[PDB]
């Protein structure tokens, strides 16, 4: 799912 | 905090070969487990990840098609099944944690007729 | 769409050493870097995850950091035991997976 990769963007985050 | 791997592995070209990595101890619940190879002389390559938790997956558009990533009951048992091997996929195989911050000791995949 | 770096690095034992990897606006820009030491015949080591921190265990004169698209692991205090291949690794939103960069081969001169 597109929410799958929402969650691993989110997890992944470092601005 | 480690992980532990399946032992090696000797396949013939067109054949399928499935991994195996288990956290050493117990975890709360779960981020994620990758699959990493790196080919002899070449370069490390992502193969894609799960969750342990809820089973699923995500994977590279360059294995789509080829792999299945399954997990089981536990919240850090996951499974790699490669499929159609070919002479270029001879590589140890790693699986990490979520972070790529913990590594298992890798396992040999050996494709040869 | 894929993760660059300079193909070798080297300086002088005790000199620090910086290497570079270059990526886009989907991935070191906005993901977590992490960073691996790979010497052929051994597993690869975790040096750095999460952009800055290092493994316990992992010697303190190894670094992390980012500026733009660009990641950076600084090496002070450079050993013979450093020498080896490097690997940048971060996450790409619009891909969707693991980027890995090139490598770069550090060499101690002398």
């Known amino acids: 799912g597109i929410d799958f990769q929402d969650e691993l963007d989110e997890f992944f985050k470092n601005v | 905090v480690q992980l532990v791997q399946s032992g090696t592995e000797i396949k013939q070209p067109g054949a399928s070969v499935k991994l195996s990595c288990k956290a050493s101890?117990?975890?709360?619940?779960?981020?994620?487990i990758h699959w990493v190879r790196q080919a002899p002389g070449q370069g490390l390559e992502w193969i894609g990840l799960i969750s342990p938790q809820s089973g699923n997956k995500v994977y590279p558009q360059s294995f789509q098609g080829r792999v299945i990533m399954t997990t089981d009951t536990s919240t850090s048992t996951a499974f790699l099944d490669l499929h159609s091997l070919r002479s270029e996929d001879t590589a140890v195989y790693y699986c990490?944690?979520?972070?790529?911050?913990?590594w298992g000791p890798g396992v040999l995949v050996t494709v040869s007729s | 769409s894929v993760l660059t770096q300079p193909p070798s690095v080297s300086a002088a034992p005790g000199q620090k050493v910086t290497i570079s990897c270059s990526g886009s606006?989907?991935?070191?820009?906005?993901?977590?870097v992490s960073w691996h030491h790979h010497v052929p015949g051994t597993a690869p080591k975790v040096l750095i995850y999460?952009?800055?921190n290092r493994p316990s265990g992992v010697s303190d004169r190894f670094s992390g950091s980012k500026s733009g698209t660009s990641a950076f692991l600084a090496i002070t205090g450079l050993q013979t035991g450093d020498e080896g291949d490097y690997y940048c690794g971060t996450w790409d939103t619009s891909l969707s997976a693991v980027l890995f960069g090139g490598g770069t081969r550090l060499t101690v001169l002398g």
């Open positions: 101890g117990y975890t709360f619940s779960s981020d994620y």
């Open positions: 999460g952009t800055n």
């Open positions: 606006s989907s991935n070191i820009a906005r993901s977590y």
């Open positions: 990490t944690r979520g972070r790529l911050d913990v």
